């Protein structure tokens, strides 16, 4: 898509419940290009009842930078788009399930996201906002019938510098019946930066993400072999 060749706006609505505490999050951002994309999100319902770090995967893999030589399933599925079905499990206890759908229009990409979490200790880092950041991570992207499956194990650093591992299992499926090219196995490297805008007195986050896809056995010429 030529649309994916120029800067694009994106927005989201996220409806959620963790341990029964409801919230709504709205955000606007842009995707200037090269796998670097930002979102300013606020909790329209008041105070967010959870860590912005744990919410952050629910806050647009079509903005991932792809090298030529690997198909970008996320862009190729447009204009019809794709769905994301995700299960995220905190190894020390807690599950988050979510669904995302996307609309490509004149004003960019609109996402609708539902998310629910249960099994979190009321005094743990998820429900008490006790996370500082998400470590960098590499996803494995596997062919999965007409779509793709990404797995990652991400480390979320607590206030005290100890970390909790979350396992992310994401199924991306085309909406169109127009047959979309399914890539070969590859990696996608991510970084997530979260910031508080000093002008925004609402409970909010500014999220910046870098996502770049990588051919495994072109990593360097240590991996190249015939």
Q: How was this structure determined?
A: X-ray
Closest by CA to 173, choosing from 71, 73, 72, 89, is 73
- 10 Å CB burial of residue 20 (0-12, 13-18, 19+) is exposed
CA–CA separation, 56 vs 48, rounded Å? Answer: 12
Neighbouring C-beta atoms of residue 220, cutoff 10 Å: 7
Token pair 């100890």 is at which residue?
Answer: 162
> CA–CA distance from 152 to each of 53, 105, 136, 217 (Å)?
15, 30, 11, 19
List, in sequence order, every residue forming a beta bridge with 16; answer none if it has no partner. 23, 115
Q: How many structural domains compose the chain?
A: 1
Q: What residues make up the domain containing 208?
A: 1-226
Q: What is the CA radius of gyration of the chain?
A: 17
Is the bond leading into 68 cis (omega within 30 degrees of zero)?
no
């Amino acid at each position: 898509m030529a649309l994916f060749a120029k800067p694009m706006n994106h927005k989201t609505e996220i409806t959620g419940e963790f341990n029964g505490k409801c919230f709504k999050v709205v955000g606007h951002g842009s995707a200037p290009g090269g796998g670097d994309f930002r979102m300013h999100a606020y909790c329209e319902s008041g105070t967010l009842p959870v860590s912005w770090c744990v919410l952050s995967p629910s806050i647009f893999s079509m903005f991932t930078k792809y090298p030529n030589g690997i198909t970008n399933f996320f862009q190729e599925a447009f204009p019809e788009g794709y769905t994301l079905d995700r299960v995220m499990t905190r190894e020390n206890g807690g599950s988050v399930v979510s669904h995302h759908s996307y609309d490509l229009g004149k004003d960019g990409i609109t996402a609708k996201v539902s998310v629910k979490g249960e099994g979190f200790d009321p005094n743990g880092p998820t429900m008490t906002k006790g996370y500082l950041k998400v470590l960098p991570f590499v996803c494995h992207l596997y062919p999965h019938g007409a779509g793709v499956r990404m797995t990652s194990s991400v480390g979320m650093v607590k206030t005290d510098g100890s970390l909790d591992i979350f396992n992310v299992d994401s199924n991306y499926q085309p909406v169109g019946s127009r047959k979309v090219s399914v890539p070969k196995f590859h990696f996608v490297q991510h970084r997530i930066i979260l910031m508080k805008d000093k002008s925004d007195t609402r409970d909010h986050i500014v999220m910046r993400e870098i996502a770049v896809a990588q051919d495994p056995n072109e990593a360097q010429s240590a991996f190249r072999i015939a």
